[PDB]
Amino acid sequence: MLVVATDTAFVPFEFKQGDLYVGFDVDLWAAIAKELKLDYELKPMDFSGIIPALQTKNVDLALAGITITDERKKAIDFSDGYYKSGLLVMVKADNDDIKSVKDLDGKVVAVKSGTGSVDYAKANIKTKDLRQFPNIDNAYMELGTGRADAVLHDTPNILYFIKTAGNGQFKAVGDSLEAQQYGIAFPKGSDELRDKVNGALKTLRENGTYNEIYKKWFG
Numbered sequence: 001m002l003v004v005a006t007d008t009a010f011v012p013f014e015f016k017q018g019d020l021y022v023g024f025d026v027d028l029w030a031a032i033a034k035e036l037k038l039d040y041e042l043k044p045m046d047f048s049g050i051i052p053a054l055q056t057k058n059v060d061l062a063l064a065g066i067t068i069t070d071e072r073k074k075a076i077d078f079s080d081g082y083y084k085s086g087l088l089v090m091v092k093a094d095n096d097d098i099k100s101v102k103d104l105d106g107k108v109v110a111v112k113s114g115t116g117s118v119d120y121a122k123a124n125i126k127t128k129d130l131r132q133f134p135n136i137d138n139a140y141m142e143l144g145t146g147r148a149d150a151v152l153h154d155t156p157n158i159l160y161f162i163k164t165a166g167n168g169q170f171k172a173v174g175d176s177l178e179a180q181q182y183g184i185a186f187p188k189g190s191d192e193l194r195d196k197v198n199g200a201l202k203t204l205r206e207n208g209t210y211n212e213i214y215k216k217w218f219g
């Protein structure tokens with residue numbers, strides 16, 4: 001069958017609930033696979049290994065809220081974008097020093113290894129310390145203990161976490177930065193499959209299944 005990489009934990013796109021993986025990416029990929037009559041296996045893994053896993057054809061494709069960028073297109077191929085996102089700053093709820101990303105100059109920021117938040121921080125934020133972690137809930141804990149002053153990560157992730165597990169200990173500040181889109185990722189040379197997936201995605205957007213899945217996770 002097809003082996004589909006996904007993220008160890010990127011709420012609300014893929015995350016362990018019970019002993020099953022659930023999420024927008026999980027639901028979207030299942031509807032695509034039905035539409036195309038493809039059998040598959042889901043393989044959660046830490047994000048930093050995903051793009052390499054594709055480069056070496058260890059997996060057939062991936063969904064892990066993966067942002068489409070020109071640099072990654074040198075290494076892998078992408079579907080049409082299926083979700084419009086950004087980055088958001090999150091701080092402890094008692095914080096008054098940090099109102100936007102501008103106030104991160106000179107602060108300790110926690111981020112997730114291998115993701116575009118690291119690339120953004122290095123490019124635009126004169127941090128005192130950029131502390132990187134394999135998974136984003138490690139960064140949330142670094143913030144919660146006061147070992148970092150903020151976390152920078154994908155907007156829908158920061159917002160869903162606050163809403164579901166933050167327990168009033170965190171808040172988002174400022175607006176969504178760096179408008180970006182997520183795509184399904186493939187190794188080079190998967191053009192036939194990639195165009196089939198793009199076709200099935202257009203179908204789901206026209207027949208109401210995309211909107212149903214979007215409303216289930218994002219209301």
Ligand SMILES: NC(=O)CC[C@H](N)C(=O)O
Binds near residue numbers: 007065117
């Ligand atoms: N899976 C996540 O943690 C979000 C990944 C981030 N959008 C990236 O492509 O780098």
